[PDB]
Each structure stands twice: as C-alpha cells, then as structure tokens.
C-alpha cells in the first residue's frame, strides 16, 4: 500500500525512500533529516547546489557525500545510503525535486490539502479567513486533515477569484465570464 503516487520519473527515488523507510515509521525523522540536508545544501549554496554537477567523478561525488555526513549528524537513517546510491547513480542534481516531493508525500500523510485562491491582486485577510474555513469544513476536506491556502496574483486573469485544490476547482472570476459573454454573443 504505497501513498499518493509520485508517478515514475525520479520521484521513484523518493518513492522507494518513503516506502522502505515507512515500514518502520521514522519518516518524520527521515523527513527532518531531508529538511536538514536540503537546508545545509541551501545554507551552503555555493557548491552545495553548484556541486550537483555530473562532470565530477564517482569518487569526488562520494566525497561530497562524505562532506555532507561530515557536517555533524546532518544525515540520519536510510537517507545517507539514499545519497550513497544517489551519488553513485549520479542523480544528485535532481535532488531538490526529491526533497519537495517527499514534502508533498509527507504533508499528504498529514493531510494538508494545499489549495489556492487565485486572483489578479492580493486581498484582505477577512476574505482569506472566511474562504479558509469554508473549504476546510467543506466536504472537500474530510476533516482529520488540514487545509493550507495561498492567494496568488495573476495578471493573465482579469480579476475575480478561483479556488483550487484536489485537482478540483471553481472559477467564478471575470475573465472566464467575459469569455462566456463573448461566446454566447458570437452566434447569429
């Protein structure tokens, strides 16, 4: 019984890392180790990201893994061997993707159903809050699970708002309605 699929390409490292780690939980600890190692990649951005290049070596890649485990107890559990394999497999560059994806799987386990409330201009907090609770208590979320929510600014839309989550959306905005306004009048 796997979680929500990462669907093949290069999430399969993260997929195997989860489903082999999770057989004995520790995925919060493995998760925090992943957060910490992506942090120390980010905390040393010069040649933490600039040294995920493929043209180095096998040996020097393994030594960069040694520098990662050299930084205190940055790695913990399977995630070093993960890197041992990753280093050997030289898929280190697509490591950022793995991180974010494990985060998605993890907060799916928590049930944070990330949403969005697209607009062409940011809005007041009262609207945020009222919408937030709306979806939260809506059949969408079955409760027992959270509900983030992000307003974004979109100029490509002419205003209004659109709610999004669980590949399920509602647009009541302006742009689409103008469109429907032009379509209906486009007949004889």
């Amino acid at each position: 019984p796997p979680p929500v699929r990462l669907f093949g390409v290069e999430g399969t490292y993260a997929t195997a890392l989860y489903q082999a780690a999770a057989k004995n939980s520790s995925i919060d600890a493995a998760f925090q180790s992943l957060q910490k190692v992506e942090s120390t990649v980010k905390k040393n951005p010069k040649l933490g990201h600039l040294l995920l290049n493929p043209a180095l070596s096998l040996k020097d890649r393994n030594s960069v893994i040694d520098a990662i485990v050299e930084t205190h107890k940055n790695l913990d559990g399977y995630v070093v061997n993960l890197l041992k394999v990753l280093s050997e497999n030289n898929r280190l560059g697509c490591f950022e993707k793995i991180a974010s994806d494990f985060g998605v799987l993890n907060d799916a386990h928590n049930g944070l159903l990330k949403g969005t409330v697209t607009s062409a201009e940011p809005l007041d907090p009262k609207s945020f809050k009222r919408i937030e609770k709306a979806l939260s208590a809506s059949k969408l979320v079955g409760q027992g699970k959270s509900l983030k929510l992000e307003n974004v600014v979109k100029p490509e839309i002419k205003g209004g708002l659109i709610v999004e989550l669980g590949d399920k959306t509602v647009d009541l905005s302006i742009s689409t309605k103008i469109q429907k306004l032009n379509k209906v009048l486009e007949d004889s």
């Binding site: 070596s57 096998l58 040996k59 030289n90």
Partner: protein, 115 residues
C-alpha cells in the same frame, strides 16, 4: 611503472565496455589485453563514454566473458613487428605469426595508427 587494470562492465555483442579508475583512462585507439583461459584477447579504445567508462571493440571470439574481468592496459596502440624477419610468414591482425614457425623476432614494433 604501474599497469592500468579495468573491469569488464558490459559485454554487448562484439563490443566490450570497461570501467577504469580515476584518471587512468587510456587515450583513443590503445590496445587492451585480457587473459582468457584460451589465450589473450584484444580491445581497442574507441569511445570515452564518460565517468571512467570506455567502449571498445573486440578482436576475437568474445564468448564466455564474465563481467568485471581485470583487463589490462598496453599503453599504446596495436603494434606489429616489422623488418625482413616478417617476410614469408602468416600473421594475424594482432601481429602474431600463425604460421607455427615460432614467433617473429623483430627489433621494431610499430603502431597501426600513424599519420
């Protein structure tokens, strides 16, 4: 002088791939030997496939090969013996006489990749 060994990482058809070690890569068109239980077997450095991995072309019957066999560098290309000692004798591709007249002693070995 140390010799450079490598591992037979891939056998495809009549094309053999070798994983070498760090900065030990022979340049292109170098003869490589591997001692079979039947004899010796020759490769020629064709492609640096990257990451200390070199694709080469076989020179005899490539059957029976285990992955990861310790192939051996020869440094240079295939050099054959020359001189009037070579006259009237039957030589294979790798410079060996197969006339069963013993070896061809020769003061010069010369590579087959000149300008």
């Amino acid at each position: 002088s140390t010799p450079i060994t490598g591992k037979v990482t891939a056998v495809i058809g009549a094309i053999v791939d070798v994983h070498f070690e760090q900065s030990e890569l022979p340049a292109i068109l170098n003869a490589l030997e591997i001692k079979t239980p039947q004899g010796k077997l020759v490769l020629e450095v064709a492609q640096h496939l990257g990451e200390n991995t070199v694709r080469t072309i076989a020179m005899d019957g490539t059957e029976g090969l285990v992955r990861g066999e310790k192939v051996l560098d020869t440094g240079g290309p295939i050099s054959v013996p020359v001189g009037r000692e070579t006259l009237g004798r039957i030589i294979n591709v790798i410079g060996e006489p197969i006339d069963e007249r013993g070896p061809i002693k020769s003061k010069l070995r010369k590579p087959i990749h000149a300008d």
